[PDB]
From a paper:
The bacterial injectisome, or type III secretion system ([name]), is a specialized syringe-shaped protein-export system utilized by many pathogenic Gram-negative bacteria for the injection of virulence proteins (effectors) into host cells. The injectisome can be divided into three major regions: the inner- (IM) and outer-membrane (OM) spanning basal body with associated export apparatus and ATPase components, an extracellular needle, and a terminating pore inserted into the host cell membrane called the translocon. The major structural scaffold of the basal body is comprised largely of three proteins that arrange into a series of highly oligomerized, concentric rings: two intimately associated proteins localized to the IM - PrgK/EscJ/MxiJ and PrgH/EscD/MxiG, and a third protein belonging to the secretin family of OM proteins, InvG/EscC/MxiD ([name] serovar Typhimurium [name]-1, Enteropathogenic Escherichia coli (EPEC) LEE and Shigella dysenteriae nomenclature, respectively). In summary, we report the crystal structures for the cytoplasmic and periplasmic domains of PrgH and InvG, two of the main basal body components of the prototypical Salmonella [name]-1 injectisome.
For both the cytoplasmic and periplasmic domains of PrgH, we applied a 24-mer oligomerization constraint, according to the established stoichiometry. For the cytoplasmic domain of PrgH, we observed that mutation of two leucine residues to alanine or an electronegative glutamate (Leu20 and Leu87) abrogates secretion, while a more conservative mutation to tyrosine has no effect (bottom). Negative stain EM analysis demonstrates that despite being necessary for secretion the PrgH cytoplasmic domain, as observed in a PrgH130–392 mutant (lacking the N-terminal cytoplasmic domain), is not required for assembly of the basal body. To validate this, we engineered mutations of the PrgH residues corresponding to the proposed phosphothreonine interacting residues in MxiG - Arg35, Gln42 and Asp65 - to alanine. We therefore conclude that the PrgH cytoplasmic domain is unlikely to interact with pThr-modified proteins. We note however that the FHA phosphopeptide interacting loops in our PrgH structure are accessible on the cytoplasmic face of the ring model, suggesting a potential interface for protein-protein interactions. Indeed, deletion of this domain results in the formation of secretion incompetent immature basal body assemblies lacking needles suggesting a role in the correct assembly/coordination of the inner-membrane export apparatus.
Numbering used by the authors:
A (entry chain X), B (entry chain A), C (entry chain B), D (entry chain C): 14 to 119
Write the structure that this text describes.
């Protein structure tokens, strides 16, 4: 299984497990934060990351084979996708994240 | 495992264990101090160091192999990295620190 | 292990054990005295010495090999170091101290 | 072990044991007397001797070998030392003292 580690922001060092399938990361201010509590905490498929500006919401898709990891950067009325690699800084908006195997600490 | 020892500041002689991965050191005044209590004390990945001026926040990254230690000096909108050596004074801003093996007292 | 003995001041004859590593001596008036109580009394790495004038803060560094003893005299924005010898008067500011082995009374 | 015996003053005949190392004798008026009670009575390394004028503070240093006895006469910003002999009147300021072995009464 894979883990998203924040490399910057006020939550630098936070690590969020990923579930097979798609996981949403809402990145922004308190308006999004307080509005994100409307969905249950069942096997988390979404997370909120505070970021004072330049935040961009994104989704990380992990296939059932776990041989490819796609990151969907969400934009107005659309999304853009890219393939990402493990153990390397990934910049989404002003947020810097790293996706690692659970067994390979960063 | 490695330990950060402060060589100056009002906490001179304080020693902070490092965990595999990244550890944040917030260095500054009371605004940062009282605002740093918003995150839990779970296996500490962050520390606050008081310093009346010239403080610079930084991160110490310890690889899982423990064969290289990187120090990321945080700057506005960016960070600068450098490799550091054990048992030698390291200057970050006006702060002077030393990174040592747990078994090698300074 | 080594012991610092004061040879002058109002605490003349006081003896302070040294721990492997660095020990801070704050030397000055009551402003420093009452402000020095903000850190815990865990294995003391700091001490306060009253001195009506000419006091200078310093650190005594004892290596893990105990084959060299360095005294860091603290100055504004910097420190100066010197190697010191056992069983001899050492002048730091107006303070006169002596560093002796625990087994060799002065 | 050695003993200091006062040969004059209002405490004439008082005998004060000496400990290996340095012992302080504060000699003066009531200002010094009432200010001398700020240190604990642990293995005494200091004593107060009343003397209406000409009092001079001094220290008696007894080496661990007990083969030499040094008397440090304290002066402003400095001290002067001299070697003293057992069983003979020693004048410090207007105070007259005698240092004797514990087994040799005066």
């Amino acid at each position: 299984p894979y883990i998203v580690r924040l490399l910057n922001s006020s939550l630098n060092g936070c690590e969020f497990p990923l579930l097979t399938g798609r996981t949403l990361f809402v990145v922004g201010q308190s308006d999004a934060l307080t509005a994100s509590g409307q969905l249950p905490d069942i096997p988390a498929d979404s997370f909120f990351i505070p970021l004072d500006h330049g935040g961009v919401n994104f989704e990380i898709q992990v296939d059932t084979d776990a041989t490819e990891i796609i990151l969907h950067e969400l934009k107005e009325g659309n999304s853009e996708s890219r393939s990402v690699q493990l153990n390397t800084p990934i910049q989404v908006g002003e947020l810097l994240i790293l996706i690692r195997p659970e067994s390979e600490p960063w």
